[PDB]
Design an enzyme around this catalytic site. Structure first.
Site, mmCIF file in Angstrom:
data_model
loop_
_atom_site.group_PDB
_atom_site.id
_atom_site.type_symbol
_atom_site.label_atom_id
_atom_site.label_comp_id
_atom_site.label_asym_id
_atom_site.label_seq_id
_atom_site.Cartn_x
_atom_site.Cartn_y
_atom_site.Cartn_z
ATOM 1 N N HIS A 69 53.890 38.502 -2.558
ATOM 2 C CA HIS A 69 54.806 39.296 -1.752
ATOM 3 C C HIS A 69 56.224 39.212 -2.280
ATOM 4 N N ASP A 111 71.380 63.722 -20.855
ATOM 5 C CA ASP A 111 70.388 62.695 -20.602
ATOM 6 C C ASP A 111 71.010 61.371 -20.989
ATOM 7 N N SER A 170 62.445 44.665 -18.723
ATOM 8 C CA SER A 170 62.689 46.007 -18.201
ATOM 9 C C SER A 170 64.064 46.125 -17.565
ATOM 10 N N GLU A 200 70.735 37.550 -9.036
ATOM 11 C CA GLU A 200 69.628 38.475 -8.823
ATOM 12 C C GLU A 200 69.708 39.149 -7.462
ATOM 13 N N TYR A 260 72.383 39.431 -5.447
ATOM 14 C CA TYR A 260 73.542 40.313 -5.349
ATOM 15 C C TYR A 260 73.348 41.580 -6.179
ATOM 16 N N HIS A 287 74.554 26.905 -4.244
ATOM 17 C CA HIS A 287 74.365 26.850 -2.803
ATOM 18 C C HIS A 287 72.903 26.794 -2.399
ATOM 19 N N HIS A 288 71.977 27.008 -3.325
ATOM 20 C CA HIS A 288 70.565 26.946 -2.979
ATOM 21 C C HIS A 288 70.004 25.531 -3.005
ATOM 22 N N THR A 295 82.760 41.273 0.717
ATOM 23 C CA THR A 295 81.749 41.936 1.533
ATOM 24 C C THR A 295 82.344 42.418 2.848
ATOM 25 N N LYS A 303 84.257 45.528 2.200
ATOM 26 C CA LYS A 303 83.354 46.676 2.133
ATOM 27 C C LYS A 303 82.904 47.128 3.519
HETATM 28 C C1 HEA Z 1 62.912 42.905 -0.644
HETATM 29 C C2 HEA Z 1 62.077 41.889 -0.564
HETATM 30 C C3 HEA Z 1 61.325 41.534 0.661
HETATM 31 C C4 HEA Z 1 61.033 42.295 1.881
HETATM 32 C C5 HEA Z 1 61.380 43.683 2.344
HETATM 33 C C6 HEA Z 1 60.236 41.301 2.631
HETATM 34 C C7 HEA Z 1 59.727 41.617 3.961
HETATM 35 C C8 HEA Z 1 58.651 40.935 4.669
HETATM 36 N N1 HEA Z 1 58.251 39.705 4.312
HETATM 37 FE FE1 HEA Z 1 58.959 38.458 2.777
HETATM 38 N N2 HEA Z 1 59.721 37.305 1.206
HETATM 39 C C9 HEA Z 1 60.401 37.733 0.133
HETATM 40 C C10 HEA Z 1 60.698 39.149 -0.109
HETATM 41 C C11 HEA Z 1 60.663 40.234 0.872
HETATM 42 N N3 HEA Z 1 60.034 40.106 2.052
HETATM 43 C C12 HEA Z 1 60.817 36.689 -0.814
HETATM 44 C C13 HEA Z 1 61.598 36.877 -2.081
HETATM 45 C C14 HEA Z 1 60.293 35.460 -0.207
HETATM 46 C C15 HEA Z 1 60.460 34.053 -0.724
HETATM 47 C C16 HEA Z 1 59.170 33.297 -0.975
HETATM 48 C C17 HEA Z 1 59.417 31.880 -0.529
HETATM 49 O O1 HEA Z 1 60.239 31.674 0.390
HETATM 50 O O2 HEA Z 1 58.798 30.966 -1.102
HETATM 51 C C18 HEA Z 1 59.641 35.976 1.026
HETATM 52 C C19 HEA Z 1 58.975 35.130 2.026
HETATM 53 C C20 HEA Z 1 58.333 35.635 3.243
HETATM 54 C C21 HEA Z 1 58.135 34.821 4.473
HETATM 55 C C22 HEA Z 1 58.589 33.402 4.719
HETATM 56 C C23 HEA Z 1 57.398 32.500 5.031
HETATM 57 C C24 HEA Z 1 57.264 31.364 4.052
HETATM 58 O O3 HEA Z 1 58.065 30.408 4.115
HETATM 59 O O4 HEA Z 1 56.340 31.424 3.218
HETATM 60 C C25 HEA Z 1 57.419 35.750 5.364
HETATM 61 C C26 HEA Z 1 56.982 35.516 6.756
HETATM 62 O O5 HEA Z 1 57.212 36.349 7.611
HETATM 63 C C27 HEA Z 1 57.245 37.012 4.630
HETATM 64 C C28 HEA Z 1 56.560 38.195 5.126
HETATM 65 C C29 HEA Z 1 57.271 39.461 5.182
HETATM 66 C C30 HEA Z 1 56.972 40.517 6.168
HETATM 67 C C31 HEA Z 1 55.934 40.519 7.253
HETATM 68 C C32 HEA Z 1 57.937 41.552 5.813
HETATM 69 C C33 HEA Z 1 58.086 42.867 6.457
HETATM 70 O O6 HEA Z 1 59.445 43.283 6.592
HETATM 71 C C34 HEA Z 1 57.346 43.868 5.588
HETATM 72 C C35 HEA Z 1 57.538 45.261 6.155
HETATM 73 C C36 HEA Z 1 58.438 46.018 5.220
HETATM 74 C C37 HEA Z 1 58.418 47.347 5.140
HETATM 75 C C38 HEA Z 1 57.501 48.147 6.012
HETATM 76 C C39 HEA Z 1 59.364 47.998 4.168
HETATM 77 C C40 HEA Z 1 59.007 49.448 3.890
HETATM 78 C C41 HEA Z 1 58.064 49.500 2.721
HETATM 79 C C42 HEA Z 1 58.385 50.086 1.565
HETATM 80 C C43 HEA Z 1 57.381 50.098 0.458
HETATM 81 C C44 HEA Z 1 59.730 50.723 1.352
HETATM 82 C C45 HEA Z 1 59.530 52.052 0.647
HETATM 83 C C46 HEA Z 1 60.812 52.466 -0.033
HETATM 84 C C47 HEA Z 1 60.871 53.589 -0.755
HETATM 85 C C48 HEA Z 1 59.681 54.475 -0.903
HETATM 86 C C49 HEA Z 1 62.141 53.991 -1.419
HETATM 87 N N4 HEA Z 1 57.764 36.979 3.280
HETATM 88 C C1 HEA Z 2 70.175 40.441 -0.301
HETATM 89 C C2 HEA Z 2 70.722 39.531 -1.070
HETATM 90 C C3 HEA Z 2 71.560 38.499 -0.447
HETATM 91 C C4 HEA Z 2 72.932 38.644 0.001
HETATM 92 C C5 HEA Z 2 73.858 39.827 -0.053
HETATM 93 C C6 HEA Z 2 73.181 37.282 0.511
HETATM 94 C C7 HEA Z 2 74.479 36.963 1.082
HETATM 95 C C8 HEA Z 2 74.949 35.657 1.529
HETATM 96 N N1 HEA Z 2 74.150 34.574 1.583
HETATM 97 FE FE1 HEA Z 2 72.123 34.393 1.052
HETATM 98 N N2 HEA Z 2 70.141 34.258 0.369
HETATM 99 C C9 HEA Z 2 69.399 35.202 -0.228
HETATM 100 C C10 HEA Z 2 69.872 36.566 -0.468
HETATM 101 C C11 HEA Z 2 71.193 37.106 -0.154
HETATM 102 N N3 HEA Z 2 72.169 36.395 0.428
HETATM 103 C C12 HEA Z 2 68.036 34.804 -0.637
HETATM 104 C C13 HEA Z 2 67.006 35.672 -1.299
HETATM 105 C C14 HEA Z 2 67.963 33.410 -0.195
HETATM 106 C C15 HEA Z 2 66.840 32.412 -0.274
HETATM 107 C C16 HEA Z 2 66.441 32.084 -1.699
HETATM 108 C C17 HEA Z 2 65.024 31.579 -1.653
HETATM 109 O O1 HEA Z 2 64.821 30.434 -1.203
HETATM 110 O O2 HEA Z 2 64.110 32.323 -2.067
HETATM 111 C C18 HEA Z 2 69.304 33.214 0.387
HETATM 112 C C19 HEA Z 2 69.705 31.949 0.966
HETATM 113 C C20 HEA Z 2 71.100 31.617 1.167
HETATM 114 C C21 HEA Z 2 71.618 30.262 0.896
HETATM 115 C C22 HEA Z 2 70.853 29.089 0.347
HETATM 116 C C23 HEA Z 2 70.233 28.369 1.538
HETATM 117 C C24 HEA Z 2 68.861 27.855 1.179
HETATM 118 O O3 HEA Z 2 68.182 28.503 0.358
HETATM 119 O O4 HEA Z 2 68.453 26.802 1.718
HETATM 120 C C25 HEA Z 2 73.029 30.363 1.287
HETATM 121 C C26 HEA Z 2 74.027 29.274 1.181
HETATM 122 O O5 HEA Z 2 75.179 29.507 0.857
HETATM 123 C C27 HEA Z 2 73.259 31.754 1.740
HETATM 124 C C28 HEA Z 2 74.524 32.263 2.259
HETATM 125 C C29 HEA Z 2 74.976 33.629 2.044
HETATM 126 C C30 HEA Z 2 76.358 34.052 2.333
HETATM 127 C C31 HEA Z 2 77.507 33.249 2.850
HETATM 128 C C32 HEA Z 2 76.346 35.464 1.978
HETATM 129 C C33 HEA Z 2 77.481 36.406 2.060
HETATM 130 O O6 HEA Z 2 77.618 37.119 0.828
HETATM 131 C C34 HEA Z 2 77.321 37.387 3.217
HETATM 132 C C35 HEA Z 2 78.682 37.988 3.530
HETATM 133 C C36 HEA Z 2 78.610 38.974 4.669
HETATM 134 C C37 HEA Z 2 79.093 38.677 5.882
HETATM 135 C C38 HEA Z 2 79.708 37.343 6.178
HETATM 136 C C39 HEA Z 2 79.005 39.699 6.981
HETATM 137 C C40 HEA Z 2 79.891 40.888 6.636
HETATM 138 C C41 HEA Z 2 81.343 40.490 6.705
HETATM 139 C C42 HEA Z 2 82.114 40.763 7.767
HETATM 140 C C43 HEA Z 2 81.584 41.494 8.961
HETATM 141 C C44 HEA Z 2 83.557 40.339 7.775
HETATM 142 C C45 HEA Z 2 83.780 39.289 8.844
HETATM 143 C C46 HEA Z 2 82.980 38.053 8.512
HETATM 144 C C47 HEA Z 2 83.583 36.917 8.144
HETATM 145 C C48 HEA Z 2 85.073 36.850 8.041
HETATM 146 C C49 HEA Z 2 82.759 35.709 7.825
HETATM 147 N N4 HEA Z 2 72.044 32.562 1.763
HETATM 148 CU CU LIG Z 3 72.317 32.782 -3.824
HETATM 149 MG MG LIG Z 4 64.599 24.033 -1.725
#
Ligand code: HEA
Ligand code: HEA
Ligand SMILES: [Cu+2]
Ligand SMILES: [Mg+2]
Ligand SMILES: CCCCCCCCCCCCCCCC(=O)OC[C@H](COP(=O)(O)OCCN)OC(=O)CCCCCCCCCCCCCCC
Ligand SMILES: CCCCCCCCCCCCCCCC(=O)OC[C@H](COP(=O)(O)OCCN)OC(=O)CCCCCCCCCCCCCCC
Ligand SMILES: CCCCCCCCCCCCCCCC(=O)OC[C@H](COP(=O)(O)OCCN)OC(=O)CCCCCCCCCCCCCCC
Ligand code: CUA
Ligand SMILES: [Zn+2]
Lengths: 534, 59, 121, 55, 269, 102, 47, 236, 133
Positions: A62, A92, A157, A243, A245, A290-291, A316, A319
């Site tokens: 997934h 193109d 890719s 990745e 971001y 931070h991870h 952010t 934006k």
């Molecule tokens: C974009 C990426 C993405 C999205 C949308 C989701 C969405 C969902 N994910 Fe998850 N998930 C991950 C990426 C994503 N996930 C990743 C990276 C992990 C980390 C693995 C780890 O932690 O070890 C994770 C882990 C993760 C957990 C954490 C459990 C764990 O610790 O193992 C769960 C449990 O609920 C889960 C299930 C689901 C379910 C039920 C949705 C539902 O929201 C699904 C329903 C979504 C839709 C219906 C979207 C529409 C479908 C489309 C195809 C869009 C079509 C778009 C166009 C045609 C343009 N996935």
């Molecule tokens: C979609 C991509 C995406 C984006 C944009 C972000 C955005 C942010 N993330 Fe996250 N993050 C993930 C994807 C993302 N993250 C994934 C995939 C993991 C798990 C990895 C894994 O285990 O697989 C993760 C996990 C993760 C961790 C690691 C924790 C852990 O794994 O145990 C942390 C720690 O710093 C974090 C924090 C933040 C913060 C502070 C932002 C900020 O950039 C968000 C900023 C936005 C706001 C704050 C709201 C908008 C702002 C306003 C409305 C202005 C007013 C607000 C303030 C003044 C605060 N997130």
């Molecule tokens: Cu990160």
């Molecule tokens: Mg860990």
């Protein structure tokens, strides 16, 4: 048709092919998500008769599918290769054969990924492919090898797509497009291509290091040999937060391009918007530690990295507040792309606030690998990927395809996926705030209520996707009848208030970019004459 | 030799595909396509023996 | 008999006269001899000053009213032309599609663009 | 005769911003002074009774 | 020129390439290579034959791709100034990507070795390191890479000068010289002093030097095809791109080998 | 750059005299109303004069309709309406409020 | 090479011009996409 | 201590770490609810006002004062939420003069604890594993997936330094009731201090991926009083 | 220009038949109305004013809204039917699936509450886990 599609060189056909692969792999990813929620629905392994290895296999399936095979080849691939040549008025894309090899090396990644699932044991390691869990001792069988090759092919890719995009927008701007006058989505594709180019080599390096440890008896991360898995954690998250971001930047671009044309006013400070995109891009690099606040980093290291990953919430927020200014004082014609952008704004704000509550190292000691990080990232990633993707599709589909989706079906599809996504990823905040660990197939017998309502929400969202693929069929076989009869919305930008109907009939499309002036589905090599700009 | 001018006139005086045009290229091209057909049809045949668990004998 | 080699700009009639002679057997090929096709045409234009592939932006000095339309040269029946106003930076960039049979109008700065074609099919 | 009606979006935007801050303050003050205060009062009452049982 | 003639050309400088099969053929070769090596390294394919066949077909498909782009450059002649600038910028970004790969390996080695478990007694640490005398075998290699860069820019200044008999001989000198360098690295790895499991230091040393060996054989292929394109007069005096990407690639690999040399034999010891 | 109300009034007076076809009248009307101010009675009188010189009634009703939707208080709307009375009675533009009885 | 553009030739499948109804293929594609993980779980529970 | 069903908060705190991060988390959630209420009210009144505003205000795009306000208000609110985060993070990191440690090594799908200061027979320390209870070995009253055979015993109210290390694969010593969650890699150890303040049973699990044996890996910590603790140490 | 009037069979109640009229009559009626437009506007009849206003600023053609007059009902009924169908399908795969755990009982929950009561865990918060029936 082999000459048009297999041997393809033009940007539009490659972009349509990118999009079709994106829908296919996203369908497979949401089916894996469905089985994840099905086994997670009740305490105990109900459906999968035990076999937690299959649950970890489906978690990494997934994860890898819906990051690297839906959101990347959708946003970078399809909308990128369709609009980045067209919004700059290029004929193109430059290096077109590289772009064709980028798309056609993606489904080889898909074939070896499904072979990684199908082959002897199964990659039971998660999308973080951490050793010693991915060593040969804890994982025999070539499953981790084939999934790692899938990650490598997707790296190839995305790297070729990024270098193709950066040269195509750095050299083939048309006769007036200076860099200050570029469209905003073009700036977003440029920024994420720059970030991909400065990030993906480190991922390819670390994954090749893991393969050398796994198959060639080396000592990079295995402790019996002096190595440590902290090096893989450093390299993989130095890839991984750039990745995600990169996953979120063209979402910002597409949402800005929806809002600034459905609110009938230009975006608030496009220079401040692109500097905010550059700031969030360059600050996605320096917060990569931070991870692993849990891992044992020192006091000054953690106190610096939490300050950086909480200062990343300034661009952010710039934006978000610029977007709220863009919707303020307009005429919000509430069609389906504007609905998707509105709910993107609210839901991405909620997820970003959850992330900034997660970012503090004094608070990450009770949240890491709980479901609270699952709430934050599924909220931000799922919303700012899927909602932006639906906004881009419902915003460009009559333009890039030339048919018309049904309108009422599009709005009920939006409402179904919004209430489904909200009701599935709001309880995971509570399940993480009371300590439910990540990646468990069986769970403590108290979490059954929220882990039941989450599996209700997954069924709601999957019903929204099945409604979406009904909309796709309806658009493909009734698009001309939808153009004629009153179902769809033909004219996207409404007539303004003192504007008549005949004047609007002669001046139907008032866009801020080229491609909405292009004909329904556009001519194969348009811009026979170079498109001049003042 | 200096066959640039003659090769330009040949490569612009053709209707054939671009990788087929200059007349040494057919002997280049046919034992590429046959070898490619073998190298893409054989590893796909080794997948059901892999998922059946049937490993490589005499090793 | 043989088509010529286009020594100057106003001589080339077709792509067949973009060939040139060759270097002899000693010194390297000069660019005027070995370059062919569109590169040869662009080299000829780089020699005689005639900049082929005009990147000249849209003349936005005056408004371009209906009685005095801004006439723009095209090689097809339509030309996507982006306007900004009476200076080069007045309003937000808006694209118009002036065609052969009808003009295009701004809706912001009131400019009227008319496509004259080069054509000759 | 008629006063020139200027600056309605300025007044509307500044009152909308201060109303958003007032609503956020109401919601967050409700959150804090309900939840955090009841949890802290329950915890200090239980620790006071444990200390009284220890004395 | 006249408008009727001006309509009969491409109207914009960028390359409108015909359809070509080398994308999907290189892609299927890459699929077959990855699938075959993943089967073979886990005991499912006994005789290592399919990996060599897929590697050969990928090499032949990339060679056919390069023959097609060379034929489009110097025979069809759609390589204008703007496409020259574009392909130069594209190669520069690719070189940035490979430099970033080697910098990722350098940062891995740095976080392994600059921060080990501390000694608390005698400083200037290394206790557990690759074997003695890793020197003079790079003191021939660094000086021949310096000579390679020197004679490459010598032959480049000869080529822009127009004297062909200097530039061809300088190109033959740098081609034979860096393939002698490649063979010297190969025989140095066979006549080594340790193996890849001798700590994280030796492991990352062998990994970085193997990747550098692969980049050096890629540079040898680039110099060979630039010599074959100079001998058949594809290169011109002003329109040369293959020589420009080859000289910038040689200088980048020179500075990366200098960096690896100094940080593995003088400072990081 | 910024501008005061009087320079705005002068600019749209000159623009409303210079509009010739029906398209230019509606364009300068849209750009005359898209601001953080309702235009002056002088600009609305010139708008009605340019709508009469262009021979199109309904834009000279959408002028009053946009004035109503642009003003913030209906007391100010009647203050505009009783002050633009002579030009409206002279050209004979029926108001949208008194055109559709419902 | 010139490609005959229209209103339905921008996608690699023939929609209107066919010998079978199209919805079978259009939902069979998404159904194969949706059923690949079911076949994966069936194989893994078979082994 | 034990997760309540339909929970909406952290568990009941038992240490200065957990009550510190609870107070910190609510201080964070206060300002974040301020911001969320702001964005929700702005979005709601913007759509409900300007969905029917037919004269689009397209001549407003500079806004320099609101731009510097958007630049300077997140910075000061981030300093506001960064002050006590820094204070508590530099507070809870030092092991401030303890008196007892215990090693908690994590082997593949089972924990093994060595009491690092107490003898068993003659110069021999005491150690035991904590296997999960298999579901056919339960009893009415005992919980599934959180009960073990050998419940680890900890004395109340002395600064105890948990040192954890992996054995084969990266684990996570994780008790959310005691407020600790610390990874374990096989290369190097990791130490963290705590102080339990009441007699109680606190559960945990390996909160990191561990292969297929990842859920069934509980940590059962029973803080009992020091006479009862010494009685259990003698009878162990 | 024009005669004394325009007939109310064509100029009155345009608002339910303008989108149904052919393009020839559309252009003819708007041409006659623009011919009427040159007169001083105190002389036009009131159906001519209503018709020319419905031509220029009417809710037809371009200015048709996104939800034509009955579609909020359709989207509410569709979302409600979809949510109830999703709950029904999830309940069907719940009933036809795997058997539940042997410890989501009543008496097992009660005796686990007894064990947590005896161990006095979760003092101020809720420790009771009944949560099943
Ligand atoms: C974009 C990426 C993405 C999205 C949308 C989701 C969405 C969902 N994910 Fe998850 N998930 C991950 C990426 C994503 N996930 C990743 C990276 C992990 C980390 C693995 C780890 O932690 O070890 C994770 C882990 C993760 C957990 C954490 C459990 C764990 O610790 O193992 C769960 C449990 O609920 C889960 C299930 C689901 C379910 C039920 C949705 C539902 O929201 C699904 C329903 C979504 C839709 C219906 C979207 C529409 C479908 C489309 C195809 C869009 C079509 C778009 C166009 C045609 C343009 N996935
Ligand atoms: C979609 C991509 C995406 C984006 C944009 C972000 C955005 C942010 N993330 Fe996250 N993050 C993930 C994807 C993302 N993250 C994934 C995939 C993991 C798990 C990895 C894994 O285990 O697989 C993760 C996990 C993760 C961790 C690691 C924790 C852990 O794994 O145990 C942390 C720690 O710093 C974090 C924090 C933040 C913060 C502070 C932002 C900020 O950039 C968000 C900023 C936005 C706001 C704050 C709201 C908008 C702002 C306003 C409305 C202005 C007013 C607000 C303030 C003044 C605060 N997130
Ligand atoms: Cu990160
Ligand atoms: Mg860990
Ligand atoms: C591995 C990563 C490869 C990155 C190559 C970047 C090359 C930049 C460049 O200059 O590439 C330009 C060329 C061709 O470009 P084109 O013919 O489309 O140009 C049209 C105008 N002349 O691409 C290549 O060399 C082929 C790349 C093959 C990669 C195979 C990887 C297998 C592993
Ligand atoms: C596998 C080994 C790959 C070794 C690369 C050899 C490239 C030879 C083709 C060539 O040199 O192509 C020459 C062409 C154009 O020729 P020109 O404009 O100089 O002709 C001018 C006549 N007046 O420039 C290029 O394509 C540059 C290609 C950049 C290098 C890409 C390498 C990708 C490697 C991925 C791994
Ligand atoms: C065997 C000899 C070589 C091949 C020669 C072909 C044989 C000729 C006769 C058959 C013709 C094939 C076509 C018709 C039959 C057929 O349904 O085909 C099957 C085709 C073969 O597609 P393809 O082969 O063109 O490759 C194309 C590689 N993808 O898969 C399909 O797309 C199945 C249809 C999927 C429908 C998806 C609908 C969703 C589209 C979303 C679009 C969104 C818009 C874009 C937004 C950015
Ligand atoms: Cu041990 Cu998870
Ligand atoms: Zn303009």
């Amino acid at each position: 048709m082999v000459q048009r599609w297999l041997y393809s060189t033009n940007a539009k056909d490659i972009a349509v092919l990118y999009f079709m692969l994106a829908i296919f792999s996203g369908m497979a990813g949401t089916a894996m998500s469905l089985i994840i929620r099905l086994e997670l629905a009740a305490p105990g392994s109900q459906y999968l008769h035990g076999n937690s290895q299959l649950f970890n296999v489906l978690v990494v399936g997934h994860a890898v599918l819906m990051i690297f095979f839906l959101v990347m080849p959708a946003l970078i691939g399809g909308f990128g290769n369709y609009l980045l040549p067209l919004m700059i008025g290029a004929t193109d894309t430059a290096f077109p054969r590289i772009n064709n090899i980028a798309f056609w090396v993606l489904p080889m990644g898909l074939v070896c990924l499904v072979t990684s699932t199908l082959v002897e044991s199964g990659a039971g390691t998660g999308w973080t492919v951490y050793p010693p869990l991915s060593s040969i001792q804890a994982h025999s069988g070539p499953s981790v090898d084939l999934a790692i090759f899938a990650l490598h092919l997707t790296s190839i890719s995305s790297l070729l797509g990024a270098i193709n995009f950066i040269v195509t927008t750095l050299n083939m701007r048309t006769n007036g497009m200076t860099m200050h006058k570029l469209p905003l989505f073009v700036w977003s594709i440029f920024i994420t291509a720059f970030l991909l180019l400065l990030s993906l080599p480190v991922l390819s390096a670390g994954i090749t290091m893991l393969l050398l440890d796994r198959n060639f008896n080396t000592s990079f991360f295995e402790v019996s040999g002096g190595g440590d898995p902290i090096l893989y954690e450093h390299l993989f998250w130095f890839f991984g937060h750039p990745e995600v971001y990169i996953l979120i930047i063209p979402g910002f671009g597409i949402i800005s391009h929806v809002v600034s044309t459905y609110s009938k006013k230009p975006v608030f400070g496009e220079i401040s918007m692109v500097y905010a995109m550059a700031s969030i891009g360059l600050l996605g690099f320096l917060v990569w530690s931070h991870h692993m606040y849990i891992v044992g980093l020192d006091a000054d290291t953690r106190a610096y990295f939490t300050s950086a990953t909480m200062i990343i919430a300034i661009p952010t927020g710039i934006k978000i507040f610029s977007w709220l200014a863009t919707i303020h004082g307009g005429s919000i014609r509430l069609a389906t792309p504007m609905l998707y952008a509105i709910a993107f704004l609210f839901l991405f704000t909620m997820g970003g606030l959850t992330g900034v509550a997660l970012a503090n190292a004094s608070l990450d000691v009770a949240f890491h690998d709980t479901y609270y990080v699952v709430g934050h990232f599924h909220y931000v990633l799922s919303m700012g990927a899927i909602f932006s993707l639906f906004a881009g599709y419902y915003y460009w589909s009559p333009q890039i395809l030339g048919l018309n989706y049904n309108e009422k079906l599009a709005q009920i599809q939006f409402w179904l996926i919004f209430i489904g996504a909200n009701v599935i990823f709001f309880p995971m905040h509570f399940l993480g705030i009371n300590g439910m660990p990540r990646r468990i197939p069986d769970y403590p017998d108290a979490f059954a209520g929220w882990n039941y309502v989450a599996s209700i929400g997954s069924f709601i969202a999957t019903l929204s996707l099945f409604l979406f693929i009904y909309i796709l069929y309806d658009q493909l076989v009734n698009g001309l009848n939808n153009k004629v009869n009153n179902k769809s919305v033909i004219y996207n930008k409404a007539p303004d208030f003192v504007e008549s109907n005949t004047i609007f009939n002669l001046n139907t499309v008032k866009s801020s970019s080229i491609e909405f002036l292009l004909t329904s589905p556009p001519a194969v090599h348009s811009f026979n004459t170079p498109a001049v700009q003042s | 030799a200096n066959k640039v001018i003659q090769l330009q006139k040949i490569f612009q005086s053709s209707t054939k595909p671009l990788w087929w045009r200059h007349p040494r290229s057919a002997l280049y091209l046919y034992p590429f396509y046959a070898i490619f057909a073998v190298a893409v049809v054989t590893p796909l045949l080794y997948i059901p023996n892999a998922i059946r668990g049937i490993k490589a004998k005499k090793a | 008999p043989v088509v010529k080699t286009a020594q100057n700009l106003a001589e080339v009639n077709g792509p067949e006269t973009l060939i040139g002679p060759g270097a002899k057997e000693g010194t390297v090929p000069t660019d005027l001899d070995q370059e062919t096709g569109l590169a040869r045409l662009e080299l000829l234009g780089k020699l005689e000053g005639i900049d082929v592939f005009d990147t000249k932006p849209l003349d936005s000095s005056r408004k371009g009213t209906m009685k005095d339309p801004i006439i723009i040269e095209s090689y097809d029946d339509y030309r996507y032309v982006g306007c900004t106003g009476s200076p080069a930076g007045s309003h937000t960039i808006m694209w118009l599609k002036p065609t052969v049979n009808e003009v295009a109008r701004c809706w912001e700065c009131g400019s009227v663009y008319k496509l004259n074609p080069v054509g000759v099919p | 005769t008629i006063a020139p009606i200027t600056g309605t979006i300025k007044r509307r935007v500044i009152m909308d911003i201060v109303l958003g801050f007032s609503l956020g303050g109401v919601m967050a003050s409700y959150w804090w002074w309900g939840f955090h205060m009841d949890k802290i009062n329950k915890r200090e009452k239980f620790y006071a009774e444990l200390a009284e049982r220890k004395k | 020129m006249t408008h009727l003639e001006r309509s009969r050309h491409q109207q914009h400088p960028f390359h409108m390439v015909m359809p070509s099969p080398w994308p999907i053929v290189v892609s299927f070769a890459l699929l077959s290579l990855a699938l075959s090596t993943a089967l073979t390294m886990h005991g499912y394919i006994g005789n290592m034959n399919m990996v060599y066949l897929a590697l050969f077909v990928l090499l032949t498909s990339s060679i056919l791709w390069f023959r097609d782009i060379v034929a489009e450059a110097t025979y069809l002649g759609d390589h204008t100034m703007a496409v020259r600038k574009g392909i130069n910028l594209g190669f520069l970004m690719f070189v940035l990507s490979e430099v970033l790969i080697f910098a990722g390996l350098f940062w891995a080695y740095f976080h392994s070795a600059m921060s080990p478990d501390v000694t608390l007694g005698a400083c200037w640490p290394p206790v557990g390191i690759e074997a003695v005398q890793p020197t003079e075998l790079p003191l021939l290699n660094t000086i021949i890479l310096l000579s390679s860069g020197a004679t490459v820019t010598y032959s480049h200044h000869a080529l822009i000068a127009g004297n062909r008999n200097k530039a061809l001989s300088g190109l033959l000198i740098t081609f034979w010289l860096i393939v002698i360098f490649v063979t010297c690295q190969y025989i140095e790895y066979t006549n080594a002093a340790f193996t890849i499991s001798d700590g994280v230091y030796g492991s990352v040393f062998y990994a970085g030097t193997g990747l550098h060996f692969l980049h050096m054989v890629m540079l040898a292929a680039m110099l060979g095809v630039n010599y074959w394109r100079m001998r058949n007069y594809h290169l011109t005096a002003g329109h040369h791109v293959g020589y420009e990407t080859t000289i910038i690639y040689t200088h980048v690999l020179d500075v990366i080998w200098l960096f690896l040399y100094v940080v593995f034999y003088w400072w990081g010891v | 750059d910024e501008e005061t109300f009087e320079e705005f009034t002068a600019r749209y007076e000159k623009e409303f005299d210079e509009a010739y076809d029906l398209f230019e009248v509606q364009r300068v009307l849209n750009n005359c109303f898209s601001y953080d101010l309702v235009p002056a009675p002088a600009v609305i009188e010139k708008a009605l004069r340019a709508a009469r010189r262009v021979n199109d009634l309904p834009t000279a009703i959408r002028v009053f309709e946009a004035l109503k939707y642009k003003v913030e208080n209906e007391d100010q709307y009647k203050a505009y309406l009783d002050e633009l009375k002579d030009v409206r009675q002279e050209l004979g533009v029926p108001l949208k409020e008194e055109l559709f009885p419902s | 090479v010139h490609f005959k553009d229209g209103v339905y030739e921008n996608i690699p499948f023939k929609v209107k011009g066919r010998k079978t109804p199209y919805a079978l293929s259009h939902f069979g594609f998404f159904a194969i996409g949706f059923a690949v993980p079911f076949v994966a779980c069936y194989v893994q529970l078979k082994k | 201590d034990v997760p309540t069903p339909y929970a909406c908060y952290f568990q009941d705190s038992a240490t200065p770490n957990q009550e510190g991060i609870l107070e910190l988390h609510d201080n964070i959630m206060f300002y974040l609810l301020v911001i969320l209420g702001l964005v929700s009210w702005m979005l709601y009144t913007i759509v409900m006002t300007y969905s029917k505003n037919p004269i689009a205000y397209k001549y407003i795009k500079h806004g320099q004062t609101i731009e510097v306000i958007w630049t300077i208000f997140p910075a000061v609110i981030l300093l506001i939420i960064a002050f006590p985060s820094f204070i508590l993070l530099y507070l809870c990191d030092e092991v401030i003069s303890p008196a007892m440690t215990i090693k908690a090594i994590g082997y593949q799908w089972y924990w093994k604890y060595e009491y690092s200061d107490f003898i068993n027979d003659s110069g021999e320390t005491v150690e035991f594993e904590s296997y999960v209870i298999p579901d056919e070995l339960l009893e009415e009253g005992q919980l599934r997936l959180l009960d073990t055979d050998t419940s680890m015993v900890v004395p109340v109210d002395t600064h105890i330094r948990f040192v954890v290390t992996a054995a084969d694969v990266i684990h996570d010593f994780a008790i959310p009731s005691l407020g600790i969650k610390v990874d374990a890699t096989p290369g190097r150890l990791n130490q963290v201090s705590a102080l339990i303040q009441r007699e109680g049973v606190f559960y945990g699990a390996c909160s990191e991926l561990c292969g297929t044996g990842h859920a069934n890996m509980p940590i059962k910590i029973e803080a009992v009083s020091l006479p009862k603790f010494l009685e259990w140490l003698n009878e162990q | 220009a024009q005669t004394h009037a325009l007939s109310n069979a064509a100029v009155m109640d345009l608002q339910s038949r303008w989108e149904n009229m052919p393009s020839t009559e559309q252009q003819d009626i708007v041409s006659k109305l623009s011919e009427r437009q040159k007169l001083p506007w105190a002389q036009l009849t009131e159906p001519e004013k209503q018709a020319v206003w419905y031509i220029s600023y009417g809710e037809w053609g371009p200015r048709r809204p996104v939800l034509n007059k009955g579609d909020s009902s359709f989207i509410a009924k569709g979302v409600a039917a979809g949510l109830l169908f999703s709950v029904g399908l999830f309940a069907v795969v719940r009933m036809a699936g795997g058997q539940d755990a042997k410890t989501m009982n009543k008496e097992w929950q009660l005796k686990s509450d007894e064990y947590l009561k005896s161990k006095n865990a979760n003092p101020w918060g809720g420790y009771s886990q009944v949560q099943s029936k």
